[PDB]
Write a protein that binds this DNA or RNA. Structure first.
Ligand SMILES: [Mn+2]
Ligand SMILES: [Mn+2]
Ligand SMILES: [Mn+2]
Ligand SMILES: [Mn+2]
Ligand SMILES: [Mn+2]
Ligand code: NA
Length: 347
DNA sequence: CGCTAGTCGTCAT
DNA sequence: ACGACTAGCG
């Protein structure tokens, strides 16, 4: 996520209703609904007691989409990405602490604090996601487990023309080059839509409304793949990209101190990290549902060697990627947990 | 003031 | 999976 991006480009946002896409196709960042839904039954998930409330929670939204004539495609997060594994280690750690503290509060008799700790120690397994998958399947609603981050998969579905809008709470989708994104959608269908073409409504952006520059800005501000330099957020990044139409981005980043009129030490490692982050936003492996095969989010340019892009996702055999996408193969154990076959969104 | 860096909140009775 | 909010920084 790009911290403070939505408020930064607020002027490009538009209050809408899902009817806007009546009869069209919309992909969903389902893990948001999964988190928000799992919060409702946090204590049960923490205790280990069986639950299925989040299933219904998601199904409210799914059914609401179906009633308005929308064709939803529930997309799920798959394998851990190396570029993001750092953050995966931190969040997983936090949960652990909150799982202890909470239990520690159950022994001390404190119940409110214990619930406030349980509500911040929730981890969405593939088992839960697969529950949601079966539930949605039993409705004719297609599902698709991304090779890695759902962000990239959604971005692909949107750019390929397979879907017209993306329902999510995450702003990263904009940096991945999505066309239309629907944020903060409630159970009734009311949300904020941000169109890529309307980025020019934001005065603050200036000439930074092109996909490449926008991406560079999002990375420079501080993203999941790379923490920003000290004292740098969206404003300064946007300012840098504004004042500099260089446009070799490396030289600009090396002259960030010059463009911002402030002393900034830029390590050689941060440049390589920036390249890695950029390449991750560009070429993260996704799954083509039609051709049924692993592909990067964008076609490999001439100025990049795919061999050096392991952090952006490792390739596996197309059959395995298919089995993961269908939700048949579990993410962690790599174990066949279901047998679904659509032959007996695709083709 | 503008801006960035951390601590809290998402559910739902 | 994330964002909103704000105290305190320059
Ligand atoms: Mn509750
Ligand atoms: Mn994999
Ligand atoms: Mn995960
Ligand atoms: Mn995501
Ligand atoms: Mn993201
Ligand atoms: Na930052």
């Amino acid at each position: 996520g790009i911290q403070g991006l939505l408020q930064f480009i607020k002027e490009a946002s538009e209050p809408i209703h899902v009817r806007k896409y009546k009869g069209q196709v919309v992909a969903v960042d389902t893990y948001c609904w999964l988190h928000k839904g799992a919060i409702a039954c946090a204590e049960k998930l923490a205790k280990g007691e069986p639950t299925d409330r989040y299933v219904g929670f998601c199904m409210k939204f799914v059914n609401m989409l179906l009633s308005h004539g929308i064709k939803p495609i529930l997309v799920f997060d798959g394998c851990t990405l190396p570029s993001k594994k750092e953050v995966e280690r931190s969040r997983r750690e936090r949960r652990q602490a909150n799982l202890l503290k909470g239990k520690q509060l159950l022994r001390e008799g404190k119940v409110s604090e214990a619930r406030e700790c349980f509500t911040r120690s929730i981890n969405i397994t593939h088992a839960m996601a697969h529950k949601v998958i079966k539930a949605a399947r039993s409705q004719g609603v297609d599902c698709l487990v991304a090779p890695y981050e759902a962000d990239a998969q959604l971005a692909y579905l949107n750019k390929a023309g397979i879907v017209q809008a993306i329902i999510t709470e995450d702003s990263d989708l904009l940096a991945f080059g999505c066309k239309k994104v629907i944020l903060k959608m409630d159970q009734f269908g009311n949300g904020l839509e941000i169109d890529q073409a309307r980025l020019g409504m934001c005065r603050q952006l200036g000439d930074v409304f092109t996909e490449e520059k926008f991406r560079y800005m999002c990375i420079l501000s501080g993203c999941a793949y790379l923490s920003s330099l000290r004292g740098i957020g969206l404003a300064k990044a946007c300012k840098v990209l504004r004042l500099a139409n260089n446009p070799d981005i490396v030289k600009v980043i090396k002259k960030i101190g010059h463009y911002l009129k402030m002393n900034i030490t830029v390590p050689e490692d941060y440049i390589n990290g920036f390249i890695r982050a950029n390449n991750t936003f560009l070429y993260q492996l996704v799954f083509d549902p039609i051709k049924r095969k692993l592909i990067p989010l964008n076609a490999y340019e001439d100025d990049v060697d795919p061999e050096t892009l392991s952090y952006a996702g490792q390739y596996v055999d197309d059959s395995i990627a298919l089995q993961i996408a269908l939700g048949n193969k579990d993410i962690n154990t790599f174990e066949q947990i279901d047998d679904y076959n659509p032959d007996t969104l695709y083709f």
